[PDB]
Amino acid sequence: MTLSILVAHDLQRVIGFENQLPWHLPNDLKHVKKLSTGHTLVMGRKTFESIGKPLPNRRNVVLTSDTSFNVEGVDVIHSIEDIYQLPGHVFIFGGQTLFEEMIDKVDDMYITVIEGKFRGDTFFPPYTFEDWEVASSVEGKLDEKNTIPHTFLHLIRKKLVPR
Ligand SMILES: NC(=O)c1ccc[n+]([C@@H]2O[C@H](COP(=O)([O-])OP(=O)(O)OC[C@H]3O[C@@H](n4cnc5c(N)ncnc54)[C@H](OP(=O)(O)O)[C@@H]3O)[C@@H](O)[C@H]2O)c1
C-alpha cells in the first residue's frame, strides 16, 4: 500500500505560519486535489483544525491522542502504527510533527517547492537529494492568480547498494 508524503515548502523549508499556508497559490491546491482525490490523507490534529473540515472526495484520517475526537467525515487513528493498516494510496499531509515522524518511512514524496522565502513557524525536515531520486520535476505555470514561482517534485527514495 503506497505511502507518500504530500507537501508544499518554500526555499527554506517553511510549510506554515500561524497554522495556515504562508502563500496564496490556487494551482497547488489543484495539484493536491488531483493527487489525493479518491485516496487517503493522513494528518495530525493541528493540521486538521487548520483546514477545519474534511477535504471532499477522499478519506480523511486524523492522528490524535484525544479519544474524544469524533468529527463527521473523518476517521480517527491514535498511533503511527495505524497508518500502515490503511488501505490504498496513503498521503501524509502534515504537519511538521507528522512529517518528522514519517519522512524516514515513506516510499516517496510529492513536494511543491515554493520558490520564495516566507516568514514561517513550522518547517519540513531537512532532506538531501543524495537520498532521493527526482522521478519528475515540473515548473508550475504562472498567471494573474498564481504569481509565485513553484516546482512540482516527485521524489523516490534511493536504494542503498554496495559501491
Ligand atoms: N505546506 C504544507 O503543505 C502543509 C500541509 C499541512 C499542514 N501544514 C502546516 O503545518 C502546521 C501544523 O503542524 P504541527 O506540527 O504544528 O501540527 P500537526 O503535525 O498537524 O499536528 C500535531 C498533532 O498531531 C497529533 N499527533 C502527532 N503525532 C502523533 C502520534 N505519534 N500519536 C498520536 N498523536 C499524534 C497530536 O495531536 P494531539 O495534541 O491532539 O494529541 C499532535 O499535537 C500548520 O501551520 C499547517 O499550516 C502545511
Side-chain angles (χ1 to χ4, degrees), residues 1-162:
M1 325 312 284
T2 307
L3 183 62
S4 308
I5 269 169
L6 184 52
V7 65
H9 73 64
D10 80 355
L11 291 166
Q12 304 186 132
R13 288 168 292 97
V14 171
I15 57 167
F17 180 70
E18 296 184 336
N19 284 113
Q20 297 300 340
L21 296 176
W23 40 85
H24 172 79
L25 191 55
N27 286 352
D28 193 46
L29 304 180
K30 284 186 268 285
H31 185 70
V32 161
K33 179 185 192 69
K34 258 158 176 57
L35 280 172
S36 62
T37 299
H39 301 297
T40 297
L41 303 173
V42 174
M43 72 198 81
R45 188 262 307 167
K46 299 189 174 185
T47 294
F48 175 68
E49 292 299 335
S50 160
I51 66 196
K53 245 135 197 63
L55 294 183
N57 305 326
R58 72 210 89 156
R59 196 191 181 168
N60 293 250
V61 177
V62 166
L63 173 63
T64 170
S65 62
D66 187 7
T67 37
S68 266
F69 198 92
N70 192 342
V71 181
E72 253 300 300
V74 173
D75 296 346
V76 186
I77 58 173
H78 292 305
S79 73
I80 294 281
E81 286 67 36
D82 290 321
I83 299 176
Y84 308 109
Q85 304 312 116
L86 296 172
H89 195 168
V90 177
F91 297 85
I92 307 302
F93 187 59
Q96 172 172 336
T97 302
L98 197 43
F99 292 136
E100 288 169 347
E101 287 185 286
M102 294 305 292
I103 187 165
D104 291 335
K105 311 293 185 177
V106 299
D107 310 311
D108 61 349
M109 313 199 280
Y110 293 84
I111 295 187
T112 301
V113 176
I114 311 285
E115 310 268 2
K117 299 191 309 184
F118 292 74
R119 171 176 299 97
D121 54 25
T122 52
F123 285 77
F124 195 74
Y127 59 95
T128 165
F129 290 96
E130 292 170 64
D131 294 342
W132 296 93
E133 173 156 33
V134 176
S136 61
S137 179
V138 179
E139 302 185 5
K141 292 291 225 295
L142 306 190
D143 66 14
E144 293 291 333
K145 322 294 310 171
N146 294 272
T147 64
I148 312 145
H150 53 289
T151 302
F152 303 114
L153 298 179
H154 180 208
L155 312 180
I156 299 179
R157 184 184 308 281
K158 289 192 186 163
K159 306 294 178 190
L160 275 171
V161 295

